[model samples]
Target: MVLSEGEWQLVLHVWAKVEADVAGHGQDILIRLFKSHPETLEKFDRVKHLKTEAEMKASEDLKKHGVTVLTALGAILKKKGHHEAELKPLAQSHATKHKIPIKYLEFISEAIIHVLHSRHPGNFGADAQGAMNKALELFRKDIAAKYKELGYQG
Candidate 1:
């Protein structure tokens, strides 16, 4: 489903508030993603060898990769009616070429919501959180469609 105009505004608003340190928060998002979904790290060639959480936490590579992922996400959020233009190619690469599971995308979005709640206390009310939920759902569906287009079975 498309985001209401107000929902887009809310998501962008909260994103702006927390992205003061997007590179930093982006790493935090990846940390949480890996912590929750350890198996997903195997796909990240840079930090794949860093087995322990401590080691994972220490990797400059992981932080840098986080910047890349989060920066991509910011670019997606910046687009209003044209989100698919951003998402389809990502799906082509991750799902089609790299064979990353759709579930990995699910996990990262989960990690993002988790980070927003933990890092910025008293900021995400039900409304803001609701807006985020819808927006990310849009993210998922757009990418999922491309995955289907590329015949990515996973």
Candidate 2:
């Protein structure tokens, strides 16, 4: 699916801020994820806690693919002095890497938009909900295919 300049920018913003938050905190952040999302914890829990700062940092780099895309968007927003533009991509990328399809993103965006409406009324607006919805829809579809491919029965 094609993303317009604006929607693409929004995607970038969401990705960067989210990663920045996660990367900055490092291990403590993952620690919290394990605490809050215990179910998800099992996926990474068997592994030893990363020791060196660099080792931990290296492990976190899997999101580089998403980060690289956001960095480009971030550069633009930063150059334009659009700091808040960082938020959208942050949220979306968090969803993306978790393998959450556009559906969850739609849920997230609308929830966040409503939140912003109360907190920062008239300061926010956008139309990428459809693209996000589409991405989520496709992601769900792909996940089902993957499960079937894995020969899982439910």
Candidate 3:
């Protein structure tokens, strides 16, 4: 899906808010992911057995990784969909080296949408929601395609 300039602007604007609280927001996203898909936690050796938000947050390893993920996300958002250089290799690594299924991106996207709503209840209106949804959909499609190219089985 091609995002209009205005839609991109809206997504970037909303993402700025998320970036402002990167650590907190990142923690929320991962925690939600773990809760929704407990099996996903096994991928992270440090956080695999973590069952609560506090436990996840308390792990220095998890905190550091959370920041790294959010920082990577910020870089992607800054590119405004022009991220083939950054995303392709990352997707390939996740699929081939990490053996993570591309489908997990959908779960992460849902967690992101949930955090957006919770963090900006009054401000996350239809336009903002639609922009985020479309933008993330584009990201997911690109990453999934890259993973497939790398021979990702799932």
TM-score of each: 0.93, 0.34, 0.93
Give the Cα lDDT of each candidate. Answer: 0.82, 0.40, 0.83
Candidate of highest lDDT? 3
Candidate 2 local lDDT, 1-154, one digit each (tens): 3345665565445434445554333344343333444443333433345444355446644234324533443353343333234444443444444444334433433443343334333333344344334333433344344434434311
Clashing pairs in 3: none
RMSD of each: 1.3, 10.6, 1.3
The runs of at least 3 residues in candidate 3 whose Cα sits more than 4 Å from the true structure, single-residue gaps closed, are none
What is candidate 3's CA lDDT for residue 1? 68
Candidate 3 whole-model C-alpha lDDT, 0 to 1: 0.83
True lDDT of residue 83, candidate 3: 93
What would the per-residue lDDT of candidate 3 be over residues 38-146, giving only the tens digit for each residue? 8788888766877787888787777788788888977987888899999977887788777787568788889889989999876678898998899889988888888
Better of 2 and 3 by TM-score: 3
- Model 1 vs truth, CA RMSD: 1.3
* TM-score quality measure for candidate 1: 0.93
Candidate 1 residue spans exceeding 4 A from truth: none
